[PDB]
Amino acid sequence: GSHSMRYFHTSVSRPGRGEPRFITVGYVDDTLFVRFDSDAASPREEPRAPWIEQEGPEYWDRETQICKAKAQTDRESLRTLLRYYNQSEAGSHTLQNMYGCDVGPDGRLLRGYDQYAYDGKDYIALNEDLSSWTAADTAAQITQRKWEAAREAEQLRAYLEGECVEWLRRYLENGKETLQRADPPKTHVTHHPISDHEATLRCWALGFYPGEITLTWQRDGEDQTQDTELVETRPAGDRTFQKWAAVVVPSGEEQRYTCHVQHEGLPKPLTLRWEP
């Protein structure tokens, strides 16, 4: 199917407690594959998936150089942003950046990204054209002017249409055992009385990969998404994910209700019911 590669970066200033902490992770789809933390002893980018371990010493060296350079750039950006927002040097602030690419089943570029948040709010983003920017405010407009003058988008475009796609293709082949395997959910339905006249039906999905899934409850065929409690999809810690969906129903009307499960790993979508 379709795939993505994303690099995530967070810098968090901590006045009086040294330089900002910098943490960056790389993903292919929902699989973590590299990490760098500036607070590690003598920090290096480290592998986190088996299929990247085969990259040579030169790969780790270049990646490590890039991570350290990005940390320094983000330190300068954080000092810049204090100026742009007229802020004191006393508080902790946060700079986030995600960049990467989406590709289709045929490996062709679907979309590229390069976007930033300051203190949890949109700051600047590369538009889908990979040629222009959206600035969230007058501060980000200053960055936009600078990056336009420097033709920074041209460099981003070349990377996103070239190396981003090409290296994603390489990782997908090298990791084809896992990255190109969808593990279906293991499912069941639990029943919990609330009161004399109501009960909770909970539909469970466990052990699935990737995280994309649809869990819905129907009453005699009618979607009940208005009344369905859907927890956030959560990591199991072994690459897989978990999720549940619950509906409160009238006692003795449980057989009206079906849970419907759609996932890439399933031979067919499931229709489940409470089985006494």
């Binding site: 690099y7 790389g26 790969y59 270049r62 990646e63 890039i66 991570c67 990005k70 750039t73 983000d74 300068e76 950006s77 810049t80 942003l81 742009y84 700079l95 960049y99 930033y116 700051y123 600047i124 960055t143 600078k146 990056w147 420097a150 920074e152 460099q155 981003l156 990377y159 190396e163 981003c164 290296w167």
Partner: peptide, 9 residues
């Protein structure tokens, strides 16, 4: 792999 170049804000 990561992009080599960038610029500060």
């Amino acid at each position: 792999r990561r992009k080599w170049r960038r610029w500060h804000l």
